[PDB]
XYZ file of C-alpha atoms in Angstrom:
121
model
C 0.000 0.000 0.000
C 0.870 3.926 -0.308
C 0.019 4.087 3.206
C 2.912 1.313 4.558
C 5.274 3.023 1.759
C 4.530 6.596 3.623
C 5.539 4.586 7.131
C 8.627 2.790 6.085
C 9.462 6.546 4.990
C 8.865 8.333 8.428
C 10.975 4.596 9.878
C 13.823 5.735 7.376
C 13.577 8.792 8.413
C 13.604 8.131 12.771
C 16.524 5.541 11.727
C 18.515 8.844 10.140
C 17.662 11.245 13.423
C 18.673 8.456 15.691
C 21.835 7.638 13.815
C 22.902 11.071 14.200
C 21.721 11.256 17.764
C 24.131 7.578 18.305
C 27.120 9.546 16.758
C 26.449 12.272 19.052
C 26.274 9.964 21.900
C 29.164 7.848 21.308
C 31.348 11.121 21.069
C 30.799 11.312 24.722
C 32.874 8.512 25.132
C 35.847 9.178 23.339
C 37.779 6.554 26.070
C 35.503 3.671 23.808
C 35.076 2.437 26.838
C 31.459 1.725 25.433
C 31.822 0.733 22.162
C 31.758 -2.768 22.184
C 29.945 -6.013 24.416
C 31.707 -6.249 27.752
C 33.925 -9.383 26.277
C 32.654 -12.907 27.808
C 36.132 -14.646 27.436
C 37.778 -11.688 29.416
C 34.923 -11.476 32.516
C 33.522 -14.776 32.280
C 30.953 -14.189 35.088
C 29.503 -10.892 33.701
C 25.890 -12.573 33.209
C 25.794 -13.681 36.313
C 25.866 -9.877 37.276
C 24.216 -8.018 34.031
C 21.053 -9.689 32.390
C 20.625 -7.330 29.847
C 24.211 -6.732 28.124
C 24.591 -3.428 26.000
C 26.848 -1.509 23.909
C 27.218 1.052 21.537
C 27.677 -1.349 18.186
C 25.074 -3.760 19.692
C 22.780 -0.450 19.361
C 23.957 0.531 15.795
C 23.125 -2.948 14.269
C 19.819 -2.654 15.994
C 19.325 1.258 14.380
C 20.768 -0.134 10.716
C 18.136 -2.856 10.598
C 15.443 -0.293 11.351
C 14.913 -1.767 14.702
C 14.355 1.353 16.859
C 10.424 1.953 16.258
C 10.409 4.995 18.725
C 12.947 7.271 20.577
C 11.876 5.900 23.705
C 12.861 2.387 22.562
C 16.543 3.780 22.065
C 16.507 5.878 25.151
C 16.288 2.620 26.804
C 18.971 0.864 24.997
C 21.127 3.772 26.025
C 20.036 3.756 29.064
C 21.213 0.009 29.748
C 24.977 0.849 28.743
C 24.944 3.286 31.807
C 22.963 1.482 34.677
C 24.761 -2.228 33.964
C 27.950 -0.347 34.111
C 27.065 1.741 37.494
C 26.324 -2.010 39.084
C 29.118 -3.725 37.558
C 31.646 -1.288 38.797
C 32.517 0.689 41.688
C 31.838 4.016 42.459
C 36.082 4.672 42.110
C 36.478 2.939 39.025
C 37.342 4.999 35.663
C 34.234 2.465 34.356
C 31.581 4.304 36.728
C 32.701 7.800 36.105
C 32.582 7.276 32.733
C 29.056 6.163 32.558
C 28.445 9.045 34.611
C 30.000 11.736 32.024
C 28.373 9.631 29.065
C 25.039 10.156 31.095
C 25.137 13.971 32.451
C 26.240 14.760 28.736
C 23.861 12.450 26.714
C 20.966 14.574 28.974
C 21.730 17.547 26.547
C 21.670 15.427 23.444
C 18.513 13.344 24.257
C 16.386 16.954 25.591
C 16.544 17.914 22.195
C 15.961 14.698 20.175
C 12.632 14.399 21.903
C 11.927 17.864 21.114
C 12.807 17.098 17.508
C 10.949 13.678 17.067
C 7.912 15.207 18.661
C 8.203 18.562 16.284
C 8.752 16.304 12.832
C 6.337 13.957 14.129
């Protein structure tokens, strides 16, 4: 139908504000101490700690196969990389104050990509 074309559009068009929104994100972490999976070989036990595993390239094959439907969905996503690592680590780790940065900067980012989504529909 014209109607699921016009969807897959506004889909196409989400996946392009939220992979701008990612870049923006992952600049806040210029350490890459969030790019990829926390490595299973290297902290074998991790699962037994964190039962919802997330990372910045886990998110960006999620975005490429148009699997974000809404910001909120992503917000989420993002939202696991910091909370797992603020339980993982401790407070006086460079791990927990980087998820802290990555969060009290993201804020800025994320105010206005709701403002945008919302606006563009």
């Amino acid at each position: 139908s014209m109607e699921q074309v016009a969807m897959e559009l506004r889909l196409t068009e989400l996946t392009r504000l939220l992979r701008s929104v990612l870049d923006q994100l992952q600049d806040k972490d210029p350490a890459r101490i969030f790019a990829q999976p926390v490595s299973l070989k290297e902290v074998p036990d991790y699962l037994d700690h964190i039962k919802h595993p997330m990372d910045f390239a886990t998110m960006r094959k999620r975005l490429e196969a148009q699997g974000y439907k809404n910001l909120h969905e992503f917000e989420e996503d993002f939202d696991l990389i910091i909370d797992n690592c603020m339980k993982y680590n401790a407070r006086d780790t460079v791990f927990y104050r980087a998820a802290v940065r990555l969060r009290d900067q993201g804020g800025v980012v994320l105010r206005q990509a709701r403002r945008e989504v919302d606006s563009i529909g």
